Coordinates of C-alpha atoms and ligand atoms in Angstrom, one line a residue:
Chain D
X1 CA 39.9 132.5 -32.5
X2 CA 39.3 134.8 -29.6
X3 CA 35.5 134.9 -30.3
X4 CA 35.4 131.2 -29.3
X5 CA 35.1 132.6 -25.7
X6 CA 31.5 133.5 -24.6
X7 CA 30.5 137.1 -25.1
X8 CA 33.6 138.3 -27.1
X9 CA 33.2 140.3 -30.4
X10 CA 36.2 141.5 -32.3
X11 CA 36.2 144.5 -34.8
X12 CA 39.2 145.9 -36.8
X13 CA 39.7 149.4 -38.4
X14 CA 42.3 149.1 -41.1
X15 CA 44.0 151.8 -43.2
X16 CA 45.8 149.8 -45.8
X17 CA 47.3 152.8 -47.5
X18 CA 48.8 154.5 -44.4
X19 CA 49.5 151.1 -42.9
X20 CA 48.0 151.3 -39.4
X21 CA 44.8 150.4 -37.6
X22 CA 43.4 149.1 -34.4
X23 CA 41.5 146.1 -33.1
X24 CA 39.0 145.9 -30.3
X25 CA 37.8 143.1 -28.3
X26 CA 34.3 143.8 -26.8
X27 CA 33.0 142.0 -23.8
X28 CA 29.3 141.5 -23.9
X29 CA 29.5 139.2 -20.8
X30 CA 31.3 140.7 -17.8
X31 CA 35.0 139.8 -17.3
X32 CA 37.6 139.6 -14.6
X33 CA 40.8 141.3 -16.0
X34 CA 44.6 141.2 -15.4
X35 CA 47.6 142.5 -17.1
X36 CA 51.4 142.0 -17.3
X37 CA 53.5 144.7 -18.9
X38 CA 56.8 143.1 -19.4
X39 CA 58.5 145.2 -22.1
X40 CA 60.7 148.2 -21.3
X41 CA 59.0 150.5 -23.7
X42 CA 55.3 150.1 -23.3
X43 CA 52.5 152.8 -23.8
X44 CA 49.2 151.9 -22.1
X45 CA 46.1 153.4 -20.8
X46 CA 43.9 152.4 -17.8
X47 CA 46.1 149.4 -16.7
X48 CA 46.1 150.4 -13.1
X49 CA 42.6 149.1 -12.5
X50 CA 43.7 145.8 -13.9
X51 CA 46.0 144.9 -11.0
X52 CA 44.9 142.7 -8.0
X53 CA 45.1 145.4 -5.4
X54 CA 42.7 147.7 -7.3
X55 CA 38.9 147.6 -7.3
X56 CA 37.1 145.4 -9.8
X57 CA 36.5 147.7 -12.8
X58 CA 33.9 147.3 -15.4
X59 CA 36.0 146.6 -18.7
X60 CA 33.8 147.2 -21.7
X61 CA 36.6 146.3 -24.2
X62 CA 40.4 146.1 -24.7
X63 CA 42.2 147.6 -27.7
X64 CA 45.4 146.8 -29.5
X65 CA 46.4 149.7 -31.6
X66 CA 49.1 151.0 -33.9
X67 CA 50.2 154.6 -33.9
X68 CA 52.8 154.5 -31.1
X69 CA 51.9 156.8 -28.2
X70 CA 49.5 158.8 -30.4
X71 CA 47.2 155.7 -31.1
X72 CA 45.9 155.5 -27.5
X73 CA 43.5 158.3 -28.8
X74 CA 41.5 155.5 -30.4
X75 CA 40.9 154.1 -27.0
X76 CA 39.1 157.3 -26.1
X77 CA 37.1 157.0 -29.4
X78 CA 35.9 153.6 -28.1
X79 CA 35.0 155.0 -24.7
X80 CA 33.0 157.7 -26.5
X81 CA 31.2 155.2 -28.6
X82 CA 30.3 153.0 -25.6
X83 CA 29.0 155.9 -23.5
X84 CA 26.6 156.7 -26.4
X85 CA 25.4 153.0 -26.5
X86 CA 24.7 153.1 -22.7
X87 CA 27.6 150.9 -21.5
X88 CA 30.0 151.4 -18.6
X89 CA 29.8 151.6 -14.8
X90 CA 26.7 153.5 -13.7
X91 CA 27.5 156.4 -11.3
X92 CA 24.0 158.0 -11.6
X93 CA 25.0 161.1 -13.4
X94 CA 26.6 159.1 -16.2
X95 CA 28.0 155.8 -17.3
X96 CA 31.8 155.4 -17.4
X97 CA 33.1 152.8 -19.8
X98 CA 36.7 151.5 -19.7
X99 CA 38.9 150.5 -22.6
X100 CA 42.4 149.6 -21.6
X101 CA 44.9 149.6 -24.5
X102 CA 48.4 149.1 -25.5
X103 CA 50.3 150.3 -28.7
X104 CA 52.8 149.1 -31.3
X105 CA 55.2 151.4 -33.1
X106 CA 54.2 151.4 -36.9
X107 CA 55.2 155.0 -37.9
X108 CA 58.2 153.8 -40.1
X109 CA 56.1 152.0 -42.7
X110 CA 53.6 153.7 -44.9
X111 CA 52.4 157.2 -43.6
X112 CA 54.1 158.4 -40.4
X113 CA 51.4 161.1 -39.9
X114 CA 48.2 158.9 -39.9
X115 CA 47.5 157.2 -36.5
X116 CA 44.4 155.6 -35.0
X117 CA 42.4 158.6 -33.6
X118 CA 38.9 159.1 -32.1
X119 CA 37.1 158.3 -35.3
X120 CA 39.1 155.2 -36.0
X121 CA 38.6 153.8 -32.5
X122 CA 34.9 154.3 -33.0
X123 CA 35.0 152.6 -36.4
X124 CA 36.6 149.6 -34.8
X125 CA 33.7 149.3 -32.3
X126 CA 31.0 149.7 -35.1
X127 CA 32.8 146.7 -36.8
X128 CA 32.8 144.5 -33.9
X129 CA 31.1 141.1 -34.5
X130 CA 30.8 137.5 -33.3
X131 CA 32.3 134.5 -35.1
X132 CA 35.5 134.3 -37.2
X133 CA 37.6 137.5 -37.8
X134 CA 40.3 138.3 -40.3
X135 CA 44.0 137.8 -39.4
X136 CA 47.3 139.0 -40.9
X137 CA 48.0 142.7 -41.8
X138 CA 44.6 143.9 -40.5
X139 CA 43.4 146.1 -37.7
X140 CA 46.1 146.6 -35.1
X141 CA 48.5 144.4 -37.1
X142 CA 48.1 146.4 -40.4
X143 CA 51.5 148.1 -40.1
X144 CA 53.3 145.4 -37.9
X145 CA 56.8 144.3 -38.8
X146 CA 59.1 141.6 -37.3
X147 CA 62.9 141.7 -36.9
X148 CA 64.3 145.3 -36.7
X149 CA 68.0 144.9 -35.9
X150 CA 68.9 146.6 -39.2
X151 CA 65.8 148.8 -39.3
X152 CA 62.5 148.4 -40.9
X153 CA 63.8 148.1 -44.5
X154 CA 65.3 144.6 -43.6
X155 CA 62.3 143.5 -41.6
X156 CA 59.6 140.9 -42.3
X157 CA 55.9 141.6 -42.2
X158 CA 54.2 141.0 -38.9
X159 CA 50.4 140.9 -38.3
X160 CA 47.5 139.9 -36.0
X161 CA 47.0 136.2 -35.1
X162 CA 44.7 134.1 -32.9
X163 CA 44.5 130.5 -31.6
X164 CA 42.3 128.4 -29.3
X165 CA 43.5 125.7 -27.0
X166 CA 40.9 123.2 -25.6
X167 CA 41.3 121.5 -22.3
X168 CA 38.9 119.0 -20.5
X169 CA 35.4 119.7 -19.5
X170 CA 34.5 122.3 -22.1
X171 CA 37.4 124.7 -20.9
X172 CA 38.9 126.9 -23.5
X173 CA 41.8 129.4 -23.5
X174 CA 42.2 131.7 -26.6
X175 CA 44.6 134.4 -27.6
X176 CA 44.8 137.3 -30.0
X177 CA 48.2 138.8 -30.6
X178 CA 49.7 141.5 -32.7
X179 CA 53.2 140.7 -33.5
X180 CA 55.6 143.7 -34.2
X181 CA 58.5 142.2 -32.4
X182 CA 62.0 143.6 -32.4
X183 CA 63.2 139.9 -32.5
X184 CA 62.7 137.0 -34.8
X185 CA 59.9 134.5 -34.8
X186 CA 60.5 130.7 -34.8
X187 CA 58.3 127.8 -35.2
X188 CA 58.0 124.8 -32.9
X189 CA 60.9 123.1 -34.7
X190 CA 63.1 126.2 -34.0
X191 CA 63.2 127.5 -37.6
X192 CA 63.2 131.2 -38.3
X193 CA 59.9 132.0 -40.2
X194 CA 60.1 135.9 -39.8
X195 CA 62.9 138.1 -38.8
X196 CA 65.7 140.5 -39.7
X197 CA 67.2 139.7 -43.2
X198 CA 70.7 140.3 -44.5
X199 CA 71.1 142.5 -47.6
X200 CA 71.8 139.3 -49.6
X201 CA 68.3 138.2 -48.6
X202 CA 68.6 135.3 -45.9
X203 CA 67.5 135.5 -42.3
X204 CA 70.4 137.0 -40.3
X205 CA 69.5 135.4 -36.9
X206 CA 69.1 138.5 -34.7
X207 CA 70.4 136.9 -31.5
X208 CA 73.5 135.4 -33.2
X209 CA 74.3 138.8 -34.8
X210 CA 74.0 140.7 -31.5
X211 CA 76.3 138.2 -29.8
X212 CA 78.9 139.0 -32.5
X213 CA 78.4 142.7 -31.8
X214 CA 75.9 144.1 -34.5
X215 CA 74.2 147.1 -33.0
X216 CA 70.4 147.8 -32.8
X217 CA 69.7 150.3 -35.6
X218 CA 65.9 150.4 -34.9
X219 CA 64.2 153.9 -34.6
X220 CA 63.5 153.4 -30.9
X221 CA 67.1 152.1 -30.1
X222 CA 68.5 155.4 -28.7
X223 CA 66.2 155.3 -25.5
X224 CA 56.6 145.0 -29.3
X225 CA 54.2 142.0 -29.0
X226 CA 50.8 142.9 -27.5
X227 CA 47.7 140.7 -26.9
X228 CA 44.7 139.3 -25.1
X229 CA 44.3 135.9 -23.6
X230 CA 40.9 134.9 -22.5
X231 CA 39.2 131.9 -20.9
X232 CA 35.6 130.8 -20.3
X233 CA 36.6 129.8 -16.6
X234 CA 35.7 131.9 -13.6
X235 CA 38.8 133.8 -12.2
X236 CA 39.6 136.1 -9.4
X237 CA 41.6 139.3 -10.1
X238 CA 44.8 137.5 -8.7
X239 CA 44.3 134.6 -11.0
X240 CA 43.7 136.9 -14.1
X241 CA 47.0 138.6 -13.3
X242 CA 48.9 135.3 -12.9
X243 CA 47.4 134.1 -16.2
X244 CA 48.7 137.2 -18.0
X245 CA 52.2 136.6 -16.3
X246 CA 52.3 133.0 -17.4
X247 CA 51.2 133.8 -20.9
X248 CA 54.5 135.7 -21.5
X249 CA 56.2 132.3 -21.4
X250 CA 54.5 131.6 -24.7
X251 CA 56.0 134.7 -26.2
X252 CA 59.5 133.7 -25.0
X253 CA 59.2 130.3 -26.8
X254 CA 58.2 132.0 -30.1
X255 CA 60.3 135.2 -30.2
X256 CA 64.0 135.9 -29.6
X257 CA 65.0 138.3 -28.4
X258 CA 61.9 139.3 -26.4
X259 CA 61.1 142.0 -23.9
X260 CA 63.9 144.2 -25.1
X261 CA 64.4 147.9 -24.5
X262 CA 62.6 148.7 -27.8
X263 CA 59.6 146.3 -27.0
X264 CA 56.4 147.4 -25.4
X265 CA 55.3 143.8 -24.7
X266 CA 52.0 143.6 -22.9
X267 CA 49.4 140.8 -22.3
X268 CA 45.9 141.4 -21.1
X269 CA 44.0 138.5 -19.5
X270 CA 40.3 137.9 -18.9
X271 CA 38.1 135.3 -17.3
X272 CA 34.3 135.5 -16.8
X273 CA 32.7 136.8 -13.7
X274 CA 29.8 134.3 -13.9
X275 CA 30.8 130.8 -15.0
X276 CA 30.5 127.3 -13.6
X277 CA 33.9 126.4 -15.1
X278 CA 37.0 126.4 -12.9
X279 CA 40.5 125.0 -13.2
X280 CA 43.9 125.6 -11.5
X281 CA 45.4 128.9 -12.7
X282 CA 48.8 127.3 -13.3
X283 CA 47.2 125.0 -15.9
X284 CA 45.2 127.9 -17.5
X285 CA 48.4 129.9 -17.5
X286 CA 50.3 127.1 -19.4
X287 CA 47.4 126.9 -22.0
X288 CA 47.6 130.7 -22.3
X289 CA 51.2 130.5 -23.1
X290 CA 50.6 127.8 -25.8
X291 CA 47.7 129.8 -27.3
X292 CA 49.8 133.0 -27.3
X293 CA 52.6 131.1 -29.0
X294 CA 50.3 129.6 -31.6
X295 CA 48.7 133.0 -32.2
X296 CA 52.1 134.6 -32.9
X297 CA 52.7 132.1 -35.8
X298 CA 49.1 132.4 -37.0
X299 CA 49.9 136.1 -37.5
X300 CA 52.6 135.4 -40.1
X301 CA 51.1 132.4 -41.9
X302 CA 48.4 135.0 -43.2
Chain S
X1 CA 55.2 177.0 -6.3
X2 CA 56.1 174.4 -8.8
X3 CA 57.7 176.9 -11.1
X4 CA 60.4 177.6 -8.7
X5 CA 62.0 174.5 -10.2
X6 CA 64.2 175.2 -13.3
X7 CA 62.5 174.9 -16.5
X8 CA 58.9 174.3 -15.3
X9 CA 55.9 176.2 -16.8
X10 CA 52.4 175.6 -15.6
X11 CA 49.1 176.3 -17.5
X12 CA 45.5 175.8 -16.5
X13 CA 42.3 175.4 -18.6
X14 CA 39.2 176.1 -16.5
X15 CA 35.5 175.7 -17.2
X16 CA 33.9 177.5 -14.3
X17 CA 30.4 176.7 -15.6
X18 CA 30.7 172.9 -16.0
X19 CA 33.2 172.8 -12.9
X20 CA 36.0 170.9 -14.6
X21 CA 39.5 171.5 -16.0
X22 CA 43.0 170.3 -16.4
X23 CA 46.5 171.6 -15.4
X24 CA 49.7 170.8 -17.2
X25 CA 53.3 171.2 -16.0
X26 CA 55.6 171.5 -19.0
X27 CA 59.3 170.6 -18.8
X28 CA 61.6 172.9 -20.8
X29 CA 64.6 171.2 -19.3
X30 CA 64.8 167.3 -19.6
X31 CA 63.6 165.5 -16.5
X32 CA 64.0 162.1 -15.0
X33 CA 60.6 160.8 -14.0
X34 CA 59.0 158.5 -11.4
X35 CA 55.6 157.5 -10.3
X36 CA 53.7 155.8 -7.4
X37 CA 50.0 154.9 -8.0
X38 CA 48.9 154.0 -4.5
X39 CA 45.0 154.6 -4.7
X40 CA 42.9 151.6 -5.5
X41 CA 40.8 153.5 -8.1
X42 CA 43.3 155.4 -10.4
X43 CA 43.0 156.1 -14.1
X44 CA 46.4 157.1 -15.7
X45 CA 48.0 157.1 -19.1
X46 CA 51.7 156.4 -20.0
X47 CA 52.8 155.5 -16.4
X48 CA 54.7 152.3 -17.6
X49 CA 57.6 154.4 -19.0
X50 CA 57.9 156.0 -15.6
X51 CA 59.1 153.0 -13.7
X52 CA 62.7 152.1 -13.0
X53 CA 62.9 149.1 -15.2
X54 CA 61.6 151.0 -18.2
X55 CA 63.7 152.9 -20.7
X56 CA 64.3 156.7 -20.0
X57 CA 61.3 158.4 -21.9
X58 CA 61.3 162.0 -23.0
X59 CA 58.6 163.4 -20.8
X60 CA 57.3 166.7 -22.4
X61 CA 54.8 167.3 -19.6
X62 CA 52.5 165.9 -16.9
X63 CA 48.9 166.6 -16.6
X64 CA 46.4 166.5 -13.7
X65 CA 42.9 166.5 -15.1
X66 CA 39.2 166.2 -14.1
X67 CA 36.7 164.3 -16.2
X68 CA 37.2 160.9 -14.5
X69 CA 38.3 158.3 -17.2
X70 CA 37.1 160.6 -20.0
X71 CA 39.5 163.3 -19.1
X72 CA 42.7 161.4 -20.2
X73 CA 41.6 162.7 -23.7
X74 CA 43.2 166.1 -22.7
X75 CA 46.5 164.4 -22.4
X76 CA 46.2 163.3 -26.1
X77 CA 45.4 167.0 -26.8
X78 CA 48.6 168.0 -25.2
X79 CA 50.5 165.3 -27.1
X80 CA 49.1 166.7 -30.4
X81 CA 50.1 170.3 -29.5
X82 CA 53.7 169.3 -28.6
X83 CA 54.1 167.3 -31.8
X84 CA 53.1 170.4 -33.7
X85 CA 55.6 172.5 -31.8
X86 CA 58.3 170.1 -32.7
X87 CA 58.9 168.5 -29.2
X88 CA 59.2 164.9 -28.4
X89 CA 61.6 161.9 -29.0
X90 CA 63.0 162.2 -32.5
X91 CA 62.4 158.9 -34.5
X92 CA 63.3 160.4 -37.9
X93 CA 59.9 160.3 -39.5
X94 CA 58.3 162.0 -36.5
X95 CA 58.7 163.4 -33.1
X96 CA 56.8 161.5 -30.2
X97 CA 56.0 163.7 -27.2
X98 CA 54.8 162.0 -23.9
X99 CA 52.3 163.5 -21.4
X100 CA 51.7 161.2 -18.6
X101 CA 48.5 162.0 -16.7
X102 CA 46.1 161.0 -13.9
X103 CA 42.4 162.0 -13.2
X104 CA 40.1 162.9 -10.5
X105 CA 36.3 162.2 -10.5
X106 CA 34.4 165.6 -10.7
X107 CA 31.3 164.5 -12.7
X108 CA 29.0 164.9 -9.6
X109 CA 29.3 168.8 -9.5
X110 CA 28.2 171.1 -12.3
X111 CA 27.7 169.4 -15.6
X112 CA 28.4 165.6 -15.8
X113 CA 28.6 165.7 -19.6
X114 CA 31.5 168.2 -20.1
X115 CA 35.0 166.8 -19.5
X116 CA 38.5 167.9 -20.6
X117 CA 38.9 166.9 -24.2
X118 CA 41.5 167.3 -27.0
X119 CA 40.9 171.0 -27.3
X120 CA 41.0 171.7 -23.5
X121 CA 44.3 169.9 -23.2
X122 CA 45.6 172.2 -26.0
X123 CA 44.3 175.3 -24.2
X124 CA 46.2 174.3 -21.1
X125 CA 49.5 174.0 -23.1
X126 CA 49.1 177.4 -24.7
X127 CA 48.6 179.0 -21.4
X128 CA 51.6 177.4 -19.7
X129 CA 54.1 179.9 -18.3
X130 CA 56.9 180.5 -15.8
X131 CA 56.4 182.4 -12.5
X132 CA 53.5 182.3 -10.1
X133 CA 50.3 180.5 -11.1
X134 CA 46.7 180.6 -9.6
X135 CA 45.7 178.1 -7.0
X136 CA 42.3 177.0 -5.6
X137 CA 39.3 175.9 -7.8
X138 CA 41.2 176.3 -11.1
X139 CA 42.5 174.0 -13.8
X140 CA 42.5 170.4 -12.6
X141 CA 41.2 171.6 -9.3
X142 CA 38.1 173.3 -10.7
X143 CA 35.5 170.6 -9.7
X144 CA 37.5 169.2 -6.7
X145 CA 35.6 168.3 -3.5
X146 CA 36.8 166.9 -0.2
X147 CA 35.0 164.7 2.3
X148 CA 32.4 162.5 0.5
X149 CA 31.3 160.0 3.2
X150 CA 27.7 161.4 2.9
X151 CA 28.0 162.3 -0.9
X152 CA 29.1 165.4 -2.7
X153 CA 26.2 167.4 -1.3
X154 CA 27.8 167.6 2.2
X155 CA 31.4 167.9 1.0
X156 CA 33.8 170.8 1.4
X157 CA 35.5 172.4 -1.8
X158 CA 38.8 171.0 -2.8
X159 CA 41.3 172.6 -5.3
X160 CA 44.8 172.8 -6.6
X161 CA 47.6 173.8 -4.3
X162 CA 51.4 174.2 -4.3
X163 CA 54.4 174.6 -1.9
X164 CA 58.2 174.8 -2.0
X165 CA 60.6 173.5 0.6
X166 CA 64.2 174.9 0.6
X167 CA 67.0 172.8 1.7
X168 CA 70.7 173.8 1.9
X169 CA 72.9 174.7 -1.1
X170 CA 70.2 176.0 -3.5
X171 CA 68.3 172.7 -3.4
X172 CA 64.5 172.9 -3.8
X173 CA 61.7 170.5 -3.6
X174 CA 58.2 171.7 -4.8
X175 CA 54.8 170.1 -5.1
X176 CA 51.5 170.7 -7.0
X177 CA 48.6 168.8 -5.8
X178 CA 44.9 168.4 -6.8
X179 CA 42.9 167.5 -3.6
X180 CA 39.6 165.7 -4.4
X181 CA 40.0 163.4 -1.4
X182 CA 37.4 161.0 -0.1
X183 CA 38.7 161.8 3.4
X184 CA 39.1 164.8 5.6
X185 CA 42.0 167.2 5.5
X186 CA 43.7 168.2 8.8
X187 CA 46.4 170.7 9.8
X188 CA 49.5 169.9 11.8
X189 CA 47.6 170.1 15.0
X190 CA 44.9 167.6 13.8
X191 CA 42.1 170.1 13.3
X192 CA 39.8 169.4 10.4
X193 CA 39.9 172.2 7.8
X194 CA 37.9 170.5 5.0
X195 CA 35.9 167.4 5.2
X196 CA 32.5 165.8 5.3
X197 CA 29.9 168.1 6.9
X198 CA 26.6 167.4 8.7
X199 CA 23.7 169.0 7.0
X200 CA 24.0 172.2 9.2
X201 CA 27.7 172.7 8.3
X202 CA 29.7 171.2 11.2
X203 CA 32.5 168.8 10.4
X204 CA 31.4 165.1 11.1
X205 CA 34.9 163.6 11.4
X206 CA 34.8 161.0 8.5
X207 CA 37.1 158.4 10.2
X208 CA 35.3 158.7 13.7
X209 CA 31.9 158.1 11.9
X210 CA 33.2 155.1 9.9
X211 CA 34.4 153.5 13.1
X212 CA 30.9 153.8 14.5
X213 CA 29.5 152.1 11.2
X214 CA 28.4 155.1 8.8
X215 CA 28.8 153.7 5.3
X216 CA 30.5 155.3 2.3
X217 CA 27.7 157.0 0.2
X218 CA 29.9 158.4 -2.5
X219 CA 29.2 157.7 -6.2
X220 CA 32.1 155.3 -6.6
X221 CA 31.5 153.5 -3.4
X222 CA 29.7 150.4 -5.0
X223 CA 32.8 149.1 -6.8
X224 CA 35.0 147.3 -4.2
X225 CA 41.5 161.0 -5.2
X226 CA 44.6 163.2 -4.5
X227 CA 47.0 163.6 -7.5
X228 CA 50.2 165.6 -7.8
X229 CA 53.7 166.3 -8.9
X230 CA 56.7 166.7 -6.8
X231 CA 59.8 168.2 -8.5
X232 CA 63.4 168.9 -7.4
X233 CA 66.3 170.8 -9.0
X234 CA 68.7 167.9 -8.1
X235 CA 69.8 165.3 -10.6
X236 CA 68.2 161.9 -9.9
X237 CA 68.4 158.4 -11.5
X238 CA 65.1 156.7 -12.4
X239 CA 65.2 154.5 -9.2
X240 CA 65.6 157.7 -7.1
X241 CA 62.7 159.5 -8.9
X242 CA 60.4 156.5 -8.1
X243 CA 61.6 156.4 -4.5
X244 CA 60.9 160.1 -4.2
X245 CA 57.3 159.5 -5.5
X246 CA 56.9 156.7 -3.0
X247 CA 58.0 158.8 0.0
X248 CA 55.9 161.7 -1.1
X249 CA 52.7 159.7 -0.2
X250 CA 53.7 160.0 3.4
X251 CA 52.9 163.7 3.2
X252 CA 49.4 162.8 1.9
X253 CA 49.0 160.4 4.9
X254 CA 49.8 163.2 7.4
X255 CA 47.3 165.6 5.9
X256 CA 44.3 163.3 4.7
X257 CA 42.4 160.7 6.6
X258 CA 41.3 158.3 5.4
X259 CA 43.7 158.1 2.4
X260 CA 44.4 155.6 -0.3
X261 CA 40.8 154.2 0.0
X262 CA 39.0 152.1 -2.6
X263 CA 37.3 155.2 -4.1
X264 CA 40.7 157.1 -4.2
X265 CA 42.9 157.2 -7.3
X266 CA 45.9 158.7 -5.5
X267 CA 48.9 159.1 -7.8
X268 CA 52.2 161.0 -7.3
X269 CA 54.6 161.8 -10.2
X270 CA 58.1 162.9 -9.3
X271 CA 60.8 164.6 -11.4
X272 CA 64.4 165.6 -11.0
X273 CA 66.7 167.2 -13.7
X274 CA 68.9 165.1 -16.1
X275 CA 71.5 167.9 -16.0
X276 CA 72.3 169.6 -12.7
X277 CA 75.3 169.8 -10.3
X278 CA 73.0 169.5 -7.3
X279 CA 72.7 166.1 -5.6
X280 CA 71.4 164.9 -2.2
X281 CA 70.3 161.7 -0.5
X282 CA 67.0 160.5 -1.9
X283 CA 65.7 159.7 1.6
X284 CA 66.1 163.4 2.4
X285 CA 64.5 164.6 -0.9
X286 CA 61.7 162.1 -0.3
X287 CA 61.1 163.5 3.2
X288 CA 61.0 167.1 1.8
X289 CA 58.6 165.9 -1.0
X290 CA 56.3 164.6 1.7
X291 CA 56.5 168.0 3.5
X292 CA 55.9 169.9 0.3
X293 CA 53.0 167.6 -0.7
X294 CA 51.4 168.1 2.7
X295 CA 51.8 172.0 2.6
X296 CA 50.3 171.9 -1.0
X297 CA 47.3 170.0 0.2
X298 CA 46.5 172.7 2.7
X299 CA 47.3 175.5 0.2
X300 CA 44.6 173.9 -2.1
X301 CA 41.8 174.6 0.4
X302 CA 42.9 177.9 1.8
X303 CA 43.1 179.7 -1.7
Ligands
LIG401 NA1 52.1 153.7 -40.6
LIG402 NA1 31.8 168.7 -13.5

């Protein structure tokens, strides 16, 4: 539950008929951000200020949205909302809020022509609250599918999931993940729980089929899992980027194949600018991986 | 003149009252793209698909916009236009266009509250045409300023410039650049042509003043831009397009000082053609792109 971390609120905007939506994490306490875009097919906005050799931005929130490339419009909707509320870096003549965002492709279920837009991004910020939030096919996970080797008709439902890992000394690492993976999702035993299905109804085992020579028939094939991991420790920008990089290891333990040519897999990481809690980044990063992994499964047990 | 390259059209949208705008380069022939974000303060969209280890996107156009972070909304305006015209990667249920973009900060001149938005991005696309285009304080360069050590009040005007370098065999490399640089711009001699000014109008020499201890008083200085497109009519791979973008920054370094600072969002996009008979070593193309970018920086402030 991402809101276990100080100052985070989460809001969803959900169109259950068109099967799309977006989710925003809002930071009421200032954060230190990092990112790792590992997939080969990612569409993002504002990620350049999240790298260690950039200046320290003032991140107001981070968005996970449907709509493929079109859905980054909802991030501008969020930016507009926040400017109206008086948030963002103060340059005197204005305040400049920043809402980095990544997308999933969800156009092949429900309505292809409805995507998160300026109004829907604003709706998600209006809805943002503390405490527990809904999981499953909601917000950015509303049109998420898993296992697309034979196209979306043989896929399983994906969704939005969350988990919190507790370490010593009051330290927490939480994740919120939207699973729309090309590959199959397995539990900690190694059982397929969501994935491409044969016509006859059983899980096909995407990786086993591809080794035999079955060809990727997904819509993007001719040329995603996205999330946020957050901790109540203090980080530097370098550590936040290292944390985001290690979190991908969690994804690799749950999803196979991962980081393919149709996947836009992206992890955002945050720590708090003011906090007395510190810990080695290699441990935080390992916990981030575990939380990310657990969140992937949470997504499909709703 | 960026439109000297096969298949490129350029359109501006200009708000001369608010002092902001955007410029789009539209690709009627399929391109191979690359990018190098070198500044420490860049705001961009869609750049991940432009790296060598990403899949080959279908880039419909690239936009240079004002408006700081808010201006990337014009890029989504362009995306909507192109979808309606039937351009973009065909996914069966839809076509998905892509319009990578980078911004300058122009909110400290004219009106801070007007920025390129969905409609302004659409206006630039509608206006996109072949042949010669206007330069100076137009389009993405409308609210551009140069030399902000002492704030925008003592700066010089920036703008949007372009240049073509001809090599052997019909090979061309062209550049289009929006100069909004923190630093001063110098000619090949090392004379200052645009830069931070003392109150009475003489050039202060930004770098000389900083070495003596004058402190950055620009709006963005408390957190601790030149943007452009270089294009060639040669066929490139994705690796070569990114190498071209990386080398092109060298041209910026020859013209602008300081460059790549903590208040600069310096970003160069590079394109080559997917279909062309023309090839050449990327290190030579890269050097010509540097020269083109340098000449375009100067064009921006003489027009
Ligand atoms: Na949909
Ligand atoms: Na302005």
